[PDB]
Amino acid sequence: WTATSGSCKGRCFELQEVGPPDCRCDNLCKSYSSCCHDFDELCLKTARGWECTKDRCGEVRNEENACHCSEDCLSRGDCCTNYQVVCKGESHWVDDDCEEIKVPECPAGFVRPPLIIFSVDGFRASYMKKGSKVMPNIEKLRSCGTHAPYMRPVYPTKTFPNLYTLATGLYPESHGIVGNSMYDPVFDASFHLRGREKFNHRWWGGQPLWITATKQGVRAGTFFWSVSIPHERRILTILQWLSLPDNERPSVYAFYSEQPDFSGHKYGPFGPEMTNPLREIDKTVGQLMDGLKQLRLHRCVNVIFVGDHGMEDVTCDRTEFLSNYLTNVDDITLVPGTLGRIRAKSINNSKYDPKTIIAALTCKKPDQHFKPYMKQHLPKRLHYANNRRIEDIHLLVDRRWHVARKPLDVYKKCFFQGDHGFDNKVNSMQTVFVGYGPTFKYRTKVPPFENIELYNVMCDLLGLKPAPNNGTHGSLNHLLRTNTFRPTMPDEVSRPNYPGIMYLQSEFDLGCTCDDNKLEELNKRLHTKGSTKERHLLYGRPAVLYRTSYDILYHTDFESGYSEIFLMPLWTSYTISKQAEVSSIPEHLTNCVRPDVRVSPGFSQNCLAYKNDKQMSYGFLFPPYLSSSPEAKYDAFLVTNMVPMYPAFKRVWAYFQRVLVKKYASERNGVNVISGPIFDYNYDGLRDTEDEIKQYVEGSSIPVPTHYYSIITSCLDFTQPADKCDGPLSVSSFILPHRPDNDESCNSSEDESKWVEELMKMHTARVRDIEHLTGLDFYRKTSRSYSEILTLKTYLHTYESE
Ligand SMILES: *[C@@H]1O[C@H](CO)[C@@H](O[C@@H]2O[C@H](CO)[C@@H](O[C@@H]3O[C@H](CO[C@H]4O[C@H](CO)[C@@H](O)[C@H](O[C@H]5O[C@H](CO)[C@@H](O)[C@H](O)[C@@H]5O[C@H]5O[C@H](CO)[C@@H](O)[C@H](O)[C@@H]5O)[C@@H]4O)[C@@H](O)[C@H](O[C@H]4O[C@H](CO)[C@@H](O)[C@H](O)[C@@H]4O[C@H]4O[C@H](CO)[C@@H](O)[C@H](O)[C@@H]4O)[C@@H]3O)[C@H](O)[C@H]2NC(C)=O)[C@H](O)[C@H]1NC(C)=O
Ligand SMILES: Cn1c(COc2ccc(C#N)cc2NC(=O)C(C)(C)C)n[nH]c1=O
Ligand SMILES: [Ca+2]
Ligand SMILES: [Cl-]
Ligand code: NA
Numbered sequence: 001w002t003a004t005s006g007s008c009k010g011r012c013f014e015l016q017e018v019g020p021p022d023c024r025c026d027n028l029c030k031s032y033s034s035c036c037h038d039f040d041e042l043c044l045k046t047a048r049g050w051e052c053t054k055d056r057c058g059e060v061r062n063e064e065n066a067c068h069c070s071e072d073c074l075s076r077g078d079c080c081t082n083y084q085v086v087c088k089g090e091s092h093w094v095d096d097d098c099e100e101i102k103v104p105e106c107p108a109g110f111v112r113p114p115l116i117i118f119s120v121d122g123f124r125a126s127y128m129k130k131g132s133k134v135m136p137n138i139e140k141l142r143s144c145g146t147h148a149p150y151m152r153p154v155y156p157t158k159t160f161p162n163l164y165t166l167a168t169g170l171y172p173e174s175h176g177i178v179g180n181s182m183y184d185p186v187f188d189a190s191f192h193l194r195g196r197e198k199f200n201h202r203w204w205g206g207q208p209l210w211i212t213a214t215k216q217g218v219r220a221g222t223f224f225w226s227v228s229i230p231h232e233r234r235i236l237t238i239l240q241w242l243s244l245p246d247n248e249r250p251s252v253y254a255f256y257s258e259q260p261d262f263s264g265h266k267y268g269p270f271g272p273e274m275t276n277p278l279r280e281i282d283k284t285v286g287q288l289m290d291g292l293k294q295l296r297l298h299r300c301v302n303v304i305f306v307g308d309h310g311m312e313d314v315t316c317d318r319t320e321f322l323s324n325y326l327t328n329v330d331d332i333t334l335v336p337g338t339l340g341r342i343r344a345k346s347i348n349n350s351k352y353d354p355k356t357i358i359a360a361l362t363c364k365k366p367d368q369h370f371k372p373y374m375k376q377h378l379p380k381r382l383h384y385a386n387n388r389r390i391e392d393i394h395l396l397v398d399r400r401w402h403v404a405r406k407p408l409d410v411y412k413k414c415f416f417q418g419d420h421g422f423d424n425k426v427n428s429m430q431t432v433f434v435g436y437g438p439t440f441k442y443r444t445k446v447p448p449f450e451n452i453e454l455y456n457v458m459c460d461l462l463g464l465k466p467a468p469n470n471g472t473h474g475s476l477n478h479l480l481r482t483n484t485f486r487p488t489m490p491d492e493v494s495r496p497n498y499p500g501i502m503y504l505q506s507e508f509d510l511g512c513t514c515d516d517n518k519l520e521e522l523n524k525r526l527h528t529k530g531s532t533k534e535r536h537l538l539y540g541r542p543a544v545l546y547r548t549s550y551d552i553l554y555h556t557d558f559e560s561g562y563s564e565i566f567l568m569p570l571w572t573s574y575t576i577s578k579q580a581e582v583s584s585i586p587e588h589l590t591n592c593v594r595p596d597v598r599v600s601p602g603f604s605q606n607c608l609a610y611k612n613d614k615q616m617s618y619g620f621l622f623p624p625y626l627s628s629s630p631e632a633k634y635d636a637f638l639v640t641n642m643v644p645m646y647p648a649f650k651r652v653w654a655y656f657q658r659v660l661v662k663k664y665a666s667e668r669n670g671v672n673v674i675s676g677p678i679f680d681y682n683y684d685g686l687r688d689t690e691d692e693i694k695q696y697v698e699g700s701s702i703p704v705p706t707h708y709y710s711i712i713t714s715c716l717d718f719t720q721p722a723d724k725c726d727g728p729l730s731v732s733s734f735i736l737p738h739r740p741d742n743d744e745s746c747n748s749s750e751d752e753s754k755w756v757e758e759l760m761k762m763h764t765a766r767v768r769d770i771e772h773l774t775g776l777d778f779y780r781k782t783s784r785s786y787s788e789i790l791t792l793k794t795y796l797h798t799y800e801s802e
């Protein structure tokens with residue numbers, strides 16, 4: 001109950017919210033049906049429209065008007081945005097040449113340049129080129145400021161998850177807004193776009209920018225605008241707040257537009273009806289810039305023009321129905337659309353089985369337009385598993401398609417021609433970023449980057465210390481003229497041991513067998529001391545950022561950091577030049593495993609456990625196929641280069657090592673490779689401690705990895721070989737799930753040349769993703785600046801076309 005009979009007189013768009021049942025005058029009041037009786041009359045004036053005209057110039061103030069053209073309007077901060085143009089012979093901001101903004105040019109009393117976040121719903125990255133003729137104000141921001149060709153959203157590519165990721169720097173799994181619709185089993189409550197539950201504070205985790213600002217004494221304007229408050233009034237309100245006295249004036253502001261998303265749903269991303277919404281958005285930007293100019297703030301404010309996600313062509317006939325796959329369809333609840341999430345309709349049903357549901361949805365029709373996953377098997381790059389609000393069963397839906405439970409759900413609930421929500425690598429889901437102002441660079445294009453990075457930068461722009469988040473602070477320093485954040489490399493926690501020859505062959509009882517000169521002996525000793533290490537370890541050894549016990553092992557063809565706790569390498573590093581040759585494993589060495597006389601039997605794996613374990617086989621991290629000489633090849637069969645592998649996974653790994661590494665070396669002019677195991681049994685994206693491992697090679701203490709990574713680095717200028725590169729680097733990486741079957745790949749009964757590389761592309765990763773998962777820190781010794789290295793570590797190779 002609200003006693004909605006107070007008044008909004010003097011209080012219009014009040015920045016502090018009043019405690020009910022006192023009536024409200026803020027933007028949220030509409031959403032609560034709690035506005036004072038006179039809110040519309042006083043706060044939403046519309047009389048005479050939105051622009052000054054010739055005959056309105058110098059008028060006598062009439063407080064009923066939507067905006068003013070009187071002489072005193074500037075001092076009041078309530079002129080229509082085109083006032084100076086029409087009445088004082090000024091030019092529109094868009095018609096002025098751009099001029100570098102080298103320093104902030106602000107009115108006296110401004111302690112820092114204000115930040116304005118101009119957020120646009122459904123604004124697809126390609127609209128910047130394709131709509132350029134009809135968006136002159138936006139094209140001026142873009143060409144005169146700092147811009148990316150596109151910005152990567154988070155998964156799922158829905159509105160609330162992405163906007164709250166912008167605000168917090170967090171993945172949806174950590175902030176808690178994991179979809180547009182959600183069930184939380186602990187609260188036993190549901191969250192929906194329509195309705196009241198979404199206003200409850202318990203849904204919203206992390207610390208958004210407006211709270212970060214307030215806690216540190218920086219004032220914030222509203223981030224939320226009621227849908228019925230027209231766009232012209234939102235702009236005028238911001239311009240009014242910027243006229244407040246120094247002690248009352250916010251330093252950060254947000255504008256939001258429901259377009260072009262609203263129209264894109266109805267007409268598709270490029271429908272002829274889409275031109276008008278893009279024109280209208282551009283006119284709004286023009287109004288802000290004209291308004292800032294009148295206030296002498298157009299060379300003072302930093303403006304961010306940013307989208308939440310793009311928009312794809314999707315129609316009703318492109319729907320798959322779970323009723324075409326499942327017999328028990330009424331015993332499940334589906335969260336439907338451009339992704340799928342499945343749980344049991346009733347917790348009292350103990351005959352519901354997720355295994356048989358997954359199997360009934362796996363590779364059943366020749367062109368099936370979704371793929372089922374247990375959430376922990378989703379590509380790690382999506383970071384979409386560590387939340388109780390994310391159902392165990394997930395469906396990744398092909399772009400252009402929907403999934404629904406039964407046909408009745410579609411025709412009893414074609415309307416739409418566009419939708420979004422798909423995998424965040426998809427080109428149609430990419431969105432926009434432009435920064436313009438004294439703190440951003442002038443006429444600068446930067447590479448594409450992820451929206452999780454922006455919170456840190458908005459904190460930098462406002463002099464705030466960011467709350468802990470998933471950005472990599474410093475990776476976006478190249479966007480900025482000043483206010484850069486100067487990070488230091490993390491300190492190494494554990495130093496390695498460097499073991500020499502300490503054990504005789506006969507001390508090993510591992511059940512392993514193998515069929516195995518003064519010039520050529522001084523040679524082998526130097527290799528084991530690290531003589532070729534400069535060739536195989538190009539960027540320094542990785543630093544271990546947790547407490548553990550490990551050894552560095554040198555060899556002719558590779559170097560490794562070998563964990564005495566996990567009984568295998570944490571990392572193995574090797575360089576393959578363009579000229580390198582592939583050989584095979586000779587017949588007499590097919591099942592050869594050799595004890596490592598630098599490492600105790602007690603800290604070694606054993607062959608008998610693999611013989612005993614009927615499900616589990618083994619592979620090698622440095623591939624024997626790529627040995628430099630028949631004698632160097634013996635090093636590759638050391639028990640210290642061995643790792644546990646399911647036979648189904650060995651098909652993948654063997655093709656990567658035998659075919660793909662040489663292919664990359666030919667195409668990239670040499671590559672440096674770092675490979676290793678990952679253990680993430682609790683699917684939190686972070687390295688497991690040893691007490692978290694759920695599976696071992698039968699009857700041993702050899703832990704089974706959940707994934708295998710590789711990081712593949714070369715020269716960005718590919719006329720220079722990987723091992724002699726003078727400038728910036730180029731990287732691609734992956735995190736392959738270590739699975740006992742290939743059910744994920746529907747063509748896997750075919751030759752590896754038809755499906756393996758496609759699997760690897762799906763599981764593409766950032767170096768930073770691997771760092772979180774292993775507790776290692778890479779690229780410690782290069783000739784490059786640390787900020788440049790941080791940008792490299794956040795890079796994702798997506799394999800999408802242009
Ligand atoms: C992306 O960036 C984020 C942010 O940096 C990273 O997430 C952090 O990860 C930290 C390490 O896992 C984690 O630290 C833990 O914090 C626990 C206290 O958490 C509360 O306080 C914080 C700070 O204010 C708050 O943010 C948290 O909010 C979470 O929980 C509520 C829901 O209840 C949500 O509203 C909110 O959205 C958020 O949820 C997310 O995080 C939780 C985990 O915290 C997930 O479960 C959710 O799914 C969701 O993803 C909390 O309100 C603290 O209790 C922990 O301490 C335990 O572990 C330590 C190890 O050091 C041990 O020594 C202690 O004994 C203790 O263990 C005890 O509890 C165990 C479990 O009950 C029990 O088994 C033991 O026996 C012990 O009794 C721990 O320090 C931090 O909370 C989050 N922060 C956020 C915002 O998510 C994230 O890792 C990054 N991702 C990647 C891939 O890099
Ligand atoms: C969506 N929306 C808005 C604008 O909301 C925003 C604009 C910019 C940022 C940032 N950074 C964040 C939000 N919102 C959020 O983060 C939510 C998820 C709490 C709503 N007004 N009206 C309306 O429907
Ligand atoms: Ca983990
Ligand atoms: Cl959703
Ligand atoms: Na076996």
Ligand code: NA
Nearest residue numbers: 742743745748
């Ligand atoms: Na298969």
Ligand SMILES: [Zn+2]
Nearest residue numbers: 122261265420
């Ligand atoms: Zn939408």
